[PDB]
Backbone:
RNA sequence: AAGAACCUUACCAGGUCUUGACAUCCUCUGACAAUCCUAGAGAUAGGACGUCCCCUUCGGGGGCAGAGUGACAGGUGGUGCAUGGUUGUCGUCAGCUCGUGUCGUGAGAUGUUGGGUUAAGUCCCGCAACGAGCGCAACCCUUGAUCUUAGUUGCCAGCAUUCAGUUGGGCACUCUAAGGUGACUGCCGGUGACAAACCGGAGGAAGGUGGGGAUGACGUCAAAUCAUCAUGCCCCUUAUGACCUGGGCUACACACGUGCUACAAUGGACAGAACAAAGGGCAGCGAAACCGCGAGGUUAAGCCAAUCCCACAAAUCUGUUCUCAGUUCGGAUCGCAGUCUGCAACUCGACUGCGUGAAGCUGGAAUCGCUAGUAAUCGCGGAUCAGCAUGCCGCGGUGAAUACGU
């Protein structure tokens, strides 16, 4: 993105407006990988597509703009 | 309308010049730029001035050379080749010794096209030694 | 390792461009159109043996000047089948193409009809020496500077390498101003696809001018 | 750099890797010192019971290799090494020639 | 194939030099002949202005003390050969002198390879040094084996 | 100055259709008035584009088909409106591009 | 997968940057010519048999 | 591979469907389908909105779609030791064969060997052989010389014209592609068994196949390809098939392979000036103007293109300066900050800013390519292609040394 702007997931934007709207929902799968974490979508758990199964990622406060699919591990390590 | 002088257009490596040498005093600056204005200096200007220094060595009449094409040896070598052939059109008997002091043939040494799988038309592909 | 398109090697230097057309802001509809009409006569020639199919682009109307060995075999019963498959091609590509006809005699001078017809004439249980010598006698005796026909590959089942290129007479295979007709076909028998490739170098035309 | 071995259609067994590796240890058991020797081997008895081997050793400034067929597939390795015998003795003798003489 | 000879060059910029025209033909590296013409003309003004003397006499005495005579042509029956004595031909003379004076003098290490190369040719003007030391070097290796490999060729 | 001269420029696949077809295209310019200009020869541009001439391997052994397409031009001088509208009777060639550019 | 591969490559793309080029006579990927409208093998064989003007080759 | 963020994609995980994504055929209804909404990350599943023929005189004809319904469809599965087709090298090296005849019980040979000469089994001459085939060559294209045709957007001498061949004008020159001409040992001096060829010279733009390209002999390697395509058999089929999201093909103790950029003063940074050729451009190129250091943004004249754009060439020349050092060299790594492309640049596009400044001071044994516009070197354009070049294919610029000899 360059200027307009940070590209939200859409489906993750609906789940973030809903679960971040109220009640502070618990972590489930979220098969998207496109955008980052959001301002209001913090706190939750993204069990995003690690390729085989999910991986519980924290909705932290340090990775403000960092990619929500970047927190997961892509290729199975390590290693030799 | 001027004196009957050289106008001989010849090429050398994709740079054909049009030397127009009138009855003059030795002024060789073609296309509005002098020999020290077009491409200085550089002691190869003596090589681009030798063919006028060979047709009895020399007149010297004027020099007006419209040279467009090639590079340093293209514009310069085409200028000396054009004033050499058209300079053969200056004096009608100048081809006796001027034809034997080089001063012709427009060598045409341009780039060779590389084949399908060559480096630069001379660079070989590679060697896997061992 | 060499082998070369004789029919593409001599094409454009002495041979004729078999596909004529203007070109063009849209070369794609021309290229696929000419391929599709080439398979149009290709499908419609199961027994006619059209030895060439030239199509000309003529401002929203194709001129598919289909050649044929025997005239009435594709020419219809006095205009029936030619108008039928012709108009059907008009609603097959989208352009009302007034397809003409052609009568190719001298089958030893026709490359693909004589060679491919020799191949399908081999697909009926005919032997390799009988098929190759028979085509060399009919088309090889029909009149030409030299015809050399070979059926290369599977024939006889096992140890598949079989190359009987039996053919005699002169051949301008490397003579670049020869203009030989040389195209192959592919026959598919029960043992395997064991096709044939033969060319008939009929004779060159001397270059002149005025 | 020495003694990489790979093979299609088969395992990369260490009882095949040391089996080829000891037997290819005869040449550098015998020569001076090299760093070389990639090996290829595969096949079976799908048709006409074969096992192609082809072992290359381009170390002594000009290449040398061989190739043989068998079904037994261990007994073609020996028939690769003793193929390399003459190629590695005739690399050294042929070149180790003392027929030199001036005016005698 | 036979002896297929080569062509020479024309007279130089300053002034009418021909062997020094070959000196400019060796003077460049990587094609750009303008930089070689500049460094060569800088050696001409540096050695003809500084160290007050002429030019064609200075180069004629440098390469005149640089153009060798004998040289080493290898051979043998095989292992442990004999480096034979093989004297130079003329164009091999000027070529070998251009190789020794160029490849020795341009690798000196002064403030510039142009002025420092002129200092290497000026030290070569004393009949010794880098280039003259090489002419004595090959001139000394040959004639060390000039009693055995002389009448073989 | 002059008038905007009516002349159709030719484009062809080979070079003989523009030559001979430009000849009979001058045969349309003999009638219809006068002043049909001669063969202003176009630049004759080509295209050279090669593909990998093997099935899978042999990446060095390529092949380079290249097919050029350029034809001459003709621009008439005298107007002749009856022949100018009569230029639509174009019969040849099979492969040729006529376009009245005026 | 020639039928689903080439047939799916004939269908409508997902995004606008999804439509990738396909093979002309044989639906191969990998360098179908966009100006001649054919593949590499298709341009070679169909061009040598006669497809448009013209040959091909060997200037330059 | 002439282009991997998804598609590509075959491979993995997950969710799906089983005459199926694509086709023919029987019946059968329908003109089909689209457009939004929801749930889903998606394929999909539900709705609502919606559709509801061109030709007969009813029986139609006709695709389209749906269903049954099995005949079928599929495989980028296995077999390149079943194959066709195609392609490498041996190699542009000059060979490779046959008809007839003769020899020899035979296989075979002879021709094709001998004498010269060539790049050549090229040519000539002897010869128990005489002939022909593919090869060699030439014919084809390009390249340096011109003639003739023909001058527009290209060229501008000869006139007026300006910032601008730009514009009245002009078709001399250059240039443009058609026909030709020109080089073929042609000619002379010889050498040579007269013949073959070979040494030397004039003349010419060009001399002994001008330079280069295309062109690759039978055969070899069971060489490469069932994955460009087609195809014999075997095997799978409510899954080795089909659809979708994400990932991977880009991983990383390590060894190689081919290239780029460097290690530096013939250099590094700047300022000014000068020289090309080639190709592409309508689903496109993008002028000028302003904005942004910047990459680029905005709008917009023009160009379907010898006119306009890409476009400015760069190495090179003239001055300042760095001065021998891991540096005012070189450039990775990596951080922050922006642009453009796209459904989306975190695995995984490039470019720009500020910063950072690895290792390298010409590289071992060994190994490579190279006969002149060549090596080497400096830039430009293009196929793929939304983006993505240090590769690939062409284009021009600077301009070398050596070949003693086998």
Residues:
């Amino acid at each position: 993105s360059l200027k307009k702007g940070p590209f939200v997931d859409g489906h993750l934007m609906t789940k973030i407006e809903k679960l971040n709207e109220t009640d502070k929902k618990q972590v489930v799968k979220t098969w998207s990988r496109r955008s980052t974490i959001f301002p209001q979508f913090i706190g939750h758990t993204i069990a995003v597509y690690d390729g085989r199964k999910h991986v519980p990622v924290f909705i932290s406060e340090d990775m403000v703009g960092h990619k929500l699919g970047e927190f997961a591990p892509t290729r199975t390590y390590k290693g030799h | 309308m001027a004196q009957v002088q050289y106008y001989g257009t010849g090429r050398r490596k994709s740079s054909v010049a049009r030397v127009r040498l009138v009855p003059g005093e030795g002024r060789i600056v073609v296309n509005n730029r002098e020999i020290s204005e077009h491409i200085p200096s550089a002691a190869l200007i003596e090589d681009i001035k030798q063919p006028l220094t060979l047709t009895e060595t020399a007149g010297t009449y004027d020099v007006l050379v419209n040279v467009h094409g090639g590079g340093l040896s293209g514009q310069a070598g085409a200028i000396r080749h054009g004033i050499a052939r058209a300079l053969l059109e200056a004096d009608p008997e100048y081809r006796t010794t001027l034809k034997r002091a080089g001063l012709l043939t427009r060598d045409a040494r341009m780039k060779e096209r590389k084949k399908y799988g060559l480096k630069g038309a001379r660079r070989a592909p590679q060697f896997s030694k061992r | 390792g060499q082998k070369v398109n004789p029919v593409g090697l001599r094409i454009g230097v002495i041979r004729d461009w078999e596909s004529k057309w203007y070109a063009g802001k849209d070369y794609a509809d021309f290229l696929h159109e000419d391929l599709k009409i080439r398979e149009y006569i290709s499908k419609r020639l199961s027994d006619a043996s059209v030895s060439k199919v030239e199509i000309e682009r003529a401002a929203n109307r194709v001129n598919i000047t289909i050649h044929t060995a025997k005239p009435g075999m594709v020419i219809g019963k006095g205009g029936s089948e030619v108008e039928a498959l012709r108009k059907a091609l008009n609603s097959l590509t989208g352009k009302r193409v007034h397809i003409n006809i052609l009568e190719i005699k001298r089958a030893d001078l026709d490359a693909q009809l004589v060679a491919d017809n020799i191949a399908r004439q081999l697909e009926n249980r005919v032997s390799f020496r009988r098929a190759q010598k028979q085509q060399i006698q009919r088309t090889m005796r029909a009149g030409a500077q030299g015809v050399k026909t070979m059926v290369s590959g599977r024939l006889g089942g096992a140890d598949i390498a079989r190359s009987e290129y039996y053919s005699e007479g002169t051949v301008p295979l490397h003579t670049l101003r020869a203009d030989i007709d040389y195209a192959t076909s592919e026959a598919d028998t029960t043992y395997g696809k064991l096709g044939v490739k033969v060319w008939i170098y009929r004779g060159e035309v001397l270059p002149t001018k005025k | 750099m020495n003694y990489n071995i790979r093979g299609e259609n088969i395992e990369v067994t260490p009882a095949l890797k040391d089996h080829v590796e000891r037997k290819i240890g005869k040449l550098e058991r015998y020569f001076d010192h090299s760093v070389d020797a990639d090996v290829n081997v595969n096949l079976k008895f799908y048709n006409d019971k074969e096992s192609k081997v082809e072992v290359t050793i381009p170390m002594t400034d000009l290449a040398l290799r061989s190739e043989v067929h068998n079904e037994d597939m261990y007994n073609a390795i020996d028939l690769a090494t003793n193929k390399l015998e003459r190629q590695i003795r005739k690399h050294k003798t042929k070149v180790n020639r003392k027929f030199r003489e001036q005016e005698s | 194939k036979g002896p297929v000879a080569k062509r020479d060059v024309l007279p130089d910029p300053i002034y009418n030099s021909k062997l020094v025209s070959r000196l400019i033909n060796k003077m460049m590296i990587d094609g750009k002949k303008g930089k070689s013409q500049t460094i060569l003309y800088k050696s001409f003004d540096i050695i003809k202005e500084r160290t007050g003397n002429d030019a064609m006499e200075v180069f004629e005495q440098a390469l005149k003390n640089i153009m060798p005579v004998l040289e080493v042509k290898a051979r043998r029956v095989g292992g442990a050969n004999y480096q034979v004595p093989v004297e130079v031909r003329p164009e091999r003379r000027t070529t070998l002198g251009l190789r020794w004076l160029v490849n020795y003098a341009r690798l000196r290490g002064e403030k510039t390879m142009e002025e420092r190369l002129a200092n290497e040719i000026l030290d070569a003007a004393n009949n010794t040094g880098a280039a003259v030391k090489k002419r004595e070097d090959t001139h000394k290796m040959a004639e060390a084996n000039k009693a055995f490999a002389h009448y073989r060729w | 100055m002059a008038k905007q001269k009516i002349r159709i420029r030719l484009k062809a696949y080979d070079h003989r259709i523009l030559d001979q077809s430009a000849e009979k295209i001058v045969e349309t310019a003999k009638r219809s008035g006068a002043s049909v200009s001669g063969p202003i020869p176009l630049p004759t541009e080509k295209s050279v584009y090669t593909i990998l001439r093997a099935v899978h391997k042999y990446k060095d052994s390529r092949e380079q088909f290249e097919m050029r397409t350029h034809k001459r031009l003709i621009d008439i001088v005298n107007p002749t409106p009856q022949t100018v509208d009569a230029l639509m009777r174009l019969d040849l060639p099979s492969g040729v591009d006529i376009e009245i550019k005026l | 997968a020639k039928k689903s591969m080439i047939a799916k490559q004939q269908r409508t793309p997902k995004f606008k940057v999804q439509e990738y080029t396909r093979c002309e006579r044989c639906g191969r990927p990998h360098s179908v010519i966009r100006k001649f409208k054919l593949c590499r093998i298709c341009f070679r064989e169909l061009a040598y048999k006669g497809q448009i003007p013209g040959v091909k080759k060997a200037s330059w």
